[PDB]
Amino acid sequence: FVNQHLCGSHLVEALYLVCXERXFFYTPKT
Amino acid sequence: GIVEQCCTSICSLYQLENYCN
């Protein structure tokens, strides 16, 4: 599920699934 | 940033994990 173009909600969902209890930060502008 | 690496180019587990805490 990770080895594709992932944008917007699709990208945030991947971060959620991969990072688990570590959590994550999503910073699209930079 | 993440958009450049995962949205406008193909994402990877390696890159996603750069954004986990």
Q: For chain A, what are the domain ranges?
A: 1-30
Angle in degrees, CA A21, A25, A30, rounded to 5: 165
Q: Give the residue on B whose Cα is nearest the Cα of A9.
A: B7
Judged by CB atoms closer than 8 Å, whether chains meet at A2 and B20 is answered as no
Resolution in A: 1.4
The contacts found for A3-7 with CB under 8 angstroms, 24 or more apart, are A3/B10, A3/B11, A3/B12, A3/B13, A4/B10, A4/B11, A5/B6, A5/B7, A5/B8, A5/B9, A5/B10, A5/B11, A6/B6, A6/B7, A6/B11, A7/B3, A7/B6, A7/B7
- Provide, for chain A, the percentages of residues in helix, strand and coil under a 3-state DSSP scheme, each rounded to the nearest 5: 45, 5, 50
Pairs of CB atoms within 8 A across A/B: 61
- The answer to whether residues B2 and A11 touch, using CB atoms and an 8 Å cutoff, is yes
